[PDB]
Amino acid sequence: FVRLTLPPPKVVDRWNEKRALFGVYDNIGILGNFEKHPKELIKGPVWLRGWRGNELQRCVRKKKFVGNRMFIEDLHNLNKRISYLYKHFNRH
Amino acid sequence: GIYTSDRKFVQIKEMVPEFVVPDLTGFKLKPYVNYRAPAGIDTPLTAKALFQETVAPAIEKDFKEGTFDANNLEKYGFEPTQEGKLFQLYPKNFPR
Amino acid sequence: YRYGMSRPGSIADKRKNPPWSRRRPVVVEPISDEDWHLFCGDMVEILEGKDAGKQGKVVQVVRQRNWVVLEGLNTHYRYIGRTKDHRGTMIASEAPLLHHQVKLVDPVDRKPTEIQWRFTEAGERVRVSTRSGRIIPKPEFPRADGIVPETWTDGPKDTSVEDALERTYVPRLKTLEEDVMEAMGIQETRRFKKVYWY
Amino acid sequence: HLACTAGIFDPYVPPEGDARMLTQRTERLRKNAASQLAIRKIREFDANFKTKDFPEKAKDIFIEAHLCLNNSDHDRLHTLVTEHCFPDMVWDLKYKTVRWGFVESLEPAQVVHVRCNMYGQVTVRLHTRQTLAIYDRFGRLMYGQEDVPKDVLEYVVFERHLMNPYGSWRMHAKIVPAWAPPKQPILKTLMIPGPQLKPWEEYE
Amino acid sequence: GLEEFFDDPKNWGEEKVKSGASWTCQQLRNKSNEDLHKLWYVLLKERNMLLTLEQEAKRQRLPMPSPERLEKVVDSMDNVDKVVQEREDALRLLQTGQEKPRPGAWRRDIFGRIVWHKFKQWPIPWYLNKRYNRRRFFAMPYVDRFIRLRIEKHARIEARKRSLQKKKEKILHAKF
Amino acid sequence: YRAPPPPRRRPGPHSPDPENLLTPRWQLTPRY
Amino acid sequence: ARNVLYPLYQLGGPQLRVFRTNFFIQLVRPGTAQPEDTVQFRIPMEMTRVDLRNYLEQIYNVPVAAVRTRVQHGSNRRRDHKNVRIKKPDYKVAYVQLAHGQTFTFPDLFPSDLRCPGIPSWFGL
RNA sequence: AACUAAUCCUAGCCCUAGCCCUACAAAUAUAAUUAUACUAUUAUAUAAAUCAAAACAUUUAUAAAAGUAUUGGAGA
């Protein structure tokens, strides 16, 4: 069934600092004499900063990067998940 | 008490508590206090306060006079051992 | 648990907050103890409400809901004693006012002047107006129980004033148990045998 | 918080034949010994309270309060009358529609008697012709006539909280003189049930 | 006396019994050691009478007049105990330096946790007490896995706590 | 709004602290 | 004294003295029919009958002839809104017979107009 | 316009980022939670298999050079 009440009114500012300053320095490499590569500006998980791969590759790279810092429970779960993923992609 | 052989109970007088009841005749303190009486700000007693109130004056006078030595530490109130007292501070061997 | 005008734990409070209630909690902006400036007996001006612009004296403060109650202001009319036999009697009941809905009043000039907390020479915290800086003294509020300490008369089992004020403690190198022994002359020559604590 | 007190401090006794009746005003001049000290107390907080001019202010509240009944302006009527007065006026009017109008006052309103932490009650004498017609939930007429003026003389008591800075004059109660005629009867006919008895008992 | 177990006959039938404020800790400290012991019984006697009256009220399904009296007595009794304890504690520290009246030490349980073990007095020494030796104060090798779980659980608790705060924060933004 | 200062790489020699455990071994080798 | 540690006794050891008593007792009207001298008391479960004898004789100076005590099991059938059993605290009932021929009796504590309905009486119109 | 029902938003969660960690009394391993003696007091071998090789047997993962070479029922 459907709502019988109106949702709260929402107004979004498209000129906020985050949106206004979005994309600045995206040309750092070409405009910065190539001292800093644009890949250096990527913020995210360490094992996938400036790198891309399939789900299996991402998990494997994650294991290598933080394997020494991973929990035993997480490490055991990752190994079990990897085994299932390995069989599916490499045999089916 | 203690249960001896033959499954016979033997009450021990020493282990049976004796209720020490204070004498309330002439005692002016009662269960309640006046609302007229101002409330008392809590100042818990501490070892430093107890030492300062009682022990410090004795040592202060003695130290100036020069009659201070290790052997007379008990004179100012030190107890080398708690044995011999009915109530032993540590280990606690007495009930409330 | 939603705080209401009814005192917590009261029969009315139980109806307001039954054990099985899981209603959406009401969010009230936290106010620090230093930040809070409204106290019972404080003359304040209602910024908004039914009696907005009418200055009143605080009589109850539910800090959990940031509610200030002014006697004889923001007062609605309700029926007390409603029963089968009788319809009920109309009475004037005050409604809660949020903290932002009132402001403190400068004594000399009656206005809703913003205030800042600052200490005095005595050290007691006093609210000081941001503009036309002045000390708003803490108001005097009657005791809720209605018992005036001076007027109180000792009843049975109540110590007299002098008895309570008497000090009999004498610092000495003896515990209370030892002190009681000296007064009552308890002497014990028996000694416990060695016990290995462990 | 109570802004009104039920009852009247001292009940003024209306004299028979006052409707026929300067004159009565002088009787107040004679009786200000009993009331002037009270009038001074109202004057102390106000200083503009005069028995001569109060009825005009009092009359407006009385007429205005009656108008609110037709529109059911409970909030407006709340301010006009005291907490005690309000429930009586509207409680029995629930789920009913009333058309009330005020015909020209037969005689001018005059203050009659006043009394007074401090609550001041002022008795006002009002004779006015009015029209009343009340209908059922279905709209059927149950009481009064749509356009028939009824001449009624009553004494109306207003009250104010002298101590409160915001205290104002609000209608508190009405004194009904015994010599006033009875109110019009209801259109419908009622039935009085007989005595109730147990099976063992017999009629008595 | 039997009469002491019950309220004043004059007070019987009264809505309440007039009583003053409870003893404060500082006033009790001012009182002497002997006075404190005397006062404790006085408070206890009143407490028993109030308790005696209250239980009869429960049987009669009636309210207790002036229930605050019992609270005042209990508050006074609680203040008395700590004041006496303070004096005893201070002297014990002075003469012996022990912060606890009962001997104790930190010991490791079979689960690998470190807990304060309160020593017990025995007529025999520990080495001659097989049952005391039978008690286990050593952690098994498998507890290492549990120790890692405990650290992970502590981190998990913090992570869950942040999620709980986040849900509360959502309404704060929505409400304000 | 005014844009933040552009990010800049730190220039000049940087000497890792040998005692620190975290510092990688290869950064402490003579080849480094 | 309850919820406290009592000193262990050895041969030749001191007599046990309780300077401060934590035991609290309540006099209760007998639920059953008992002799007048007999008195019912609710006492902590850790108190012994001998303790009551000394307690009454010393603190209250009451002479006691005989004592009979029972332990009342607290019903755990009661459950909360969550269906969790609630256990009533167990209490001990002591039947104490007075000595010297004394007798006890429980004190007597806690000794519009009908013709015109629907028109508010306020209206004078 | 009626019944049975339906209606709702926070109860909370998920992943990265960041960050290692060093968070009452009384009773208790005896029969755990029994205030004092008994009776001495004590975990763990490659991880395997399943699974893949369409069965099954050696065998079967758990920065660039580079999926190059070798190895392998030269097959997964």
Swiss-Prot record, chain B:
GO terms for molecular function: structural constituent of ribosome. One of its GO terms (cellular component) is mitochondrial large ribosomal subunit. It is found in: Mitochondrion. Signal peptide: none annotated. It comes from the Eukaryota. Disulfide bonds: none annotated. Keywords: Apoptosis, Cell cycle, Mitochondrion, Ribonucleoprotein, Ribosomal protein, Transit peptide. GO terms for biological process: apoptotic process; mitochondrial translation; translation. Component of the mitochondrial ribosome large subunit. Also involved in apoptosis and cell cycle. Enhances p53/TP53 stability, thereby contributing to p53/TP53-induced apoptosis in response to growth-inhibitory condition. Enhances p53/TP53 translocation to the mitochondria. Has the ability to arrest the cell cycle at the G1 phase, possibly by stabilizing the CDKN1A and CDKN1B (p27Kip1) proteins. Component of the mitochondrial ribosome large subunit (39S) which comprises a 16S rRNA and about 50 distinct proteins. Interacts with BCL2. Belongs to the mitochondrion-specific ribosomal protein mL41 family. This is Large ribosomal subunit protein mL41. It comes from Mus musculus.
Swiss-Prot record, chain C:
The keyword Repeat does not apply. Keywords: Mitochondrion, Phosphoprotein, Ribonucleoprotein, Ribosomal protein, Transit peptide. Its main location: mitochondrion. It is found in: Mitochondrion. Component of the mitochondrial ribosome large subunit (39S) which comprises a 16S rRNA and about 50 distinct proteins. Residues 38-71 form the KOW domain. PROSITE patterns: RIBOSOMAL_L24. SUPFAM superfamilies: Translation proteins SH3-like domain (SSF50104). Belongs to the universal ribosomal protein uL24 family. GO terms for biological process: mitochondrial translation. One of its GO terms (cellular component) is mitochondrion. The modification Phosphoserine is found at S6. It holds the Pfam family KOW. NCBIfam families: rplX_bact. SMART domains: KOW. The keyword Transit peptide applies. GO terms for molecular function: RNA binding; structural constituent of ribosome. Coiled coil: none annotated. This is Large ribosomal subunit protein uL24m. InterPro entries: KOW, Rib_uL2_dom2, Ribosomal_uL24, Ribosomal_uL24_CS, Ribosomal_uL24_KOW, Translation_prot_SH3-like_sf.
Curated annotation (Swiss-Prot), chain D:
Keywords: Mitochondrion, Ribonucleoprotein, Ribosomal protein, Transit peptide. The keyword Ribosomal protein applies. The lineage of its organism: Eukaryota, Metazoa, Chordata, Craniata, Vertebrata. It is found in: Mitochondrion. Component of the mitochondrial large ribosomal subunit (mt-LSU). Within the mitochondrial ribosomes, required to direct the nascent polypeptide toward the tunnel exit and position the exit at a distance from the membrane surface. Coiled coil: none annotated. This is Large ribosomal subunit protein mL45. One of its GO terms (biological process) is mitochondrial translation. The chain holds residues 77 to 294 of 306 of the full protein. One of its GO terms (molecular function) is structural constituent of ribosome. The gene is Mrpl45. Belongs to the mitochondrion-specific ribosomal protein mL45 family. Component of the mitochondrial ribosome large subunit (39S) which comprises a 16S rRNA and about 50 distinct proteins. It comes from the Eukaryota. GO terms for cellular component: mitochondrial inner membrane; mitochondrial large ribosomal subunit; mitochondrion.
Swiss-Prot record, chain G:
The keyword DNA damage does not apply. One of its GO terms (cellular component) is mitochondrial inner membrane. GO terms for biological process: mitochondrial translation; translation. Pfam families: Ribosomal_L23. One of its GO terms (molecular function) is structural constituent of ribosome. Keywords: Mitochondrion, Ribonucleoprotein, Ribosomal protein. It is found in: Mitochondrion. It comes from the Eukaryota. InterPro entries: Nucleotide-bd_a/b_plait_sf, Ribosomal_uL23-like, Ribosomal_uL23/eL15/eS24_sf. The keyword Mitochondrion applies. Belongs to the universal ribosomal protein uL23 family. PANTHER family: LARGE RIBOSOMAL SUBUNIT PROTEIN UL23M, RIBOSOMAL PROTEIN L23-RELATED. Component of the mitochondrial ribosome large subunit (39S) which comprises a 16S rRNA and about 50 distinct proteins. This is Large ribosomal subunit protein uL23m. The lineage of its organism: Eukaryota, Metazoa, Chordata, Craniata, Vertebrata. The gene is Mrpl23.
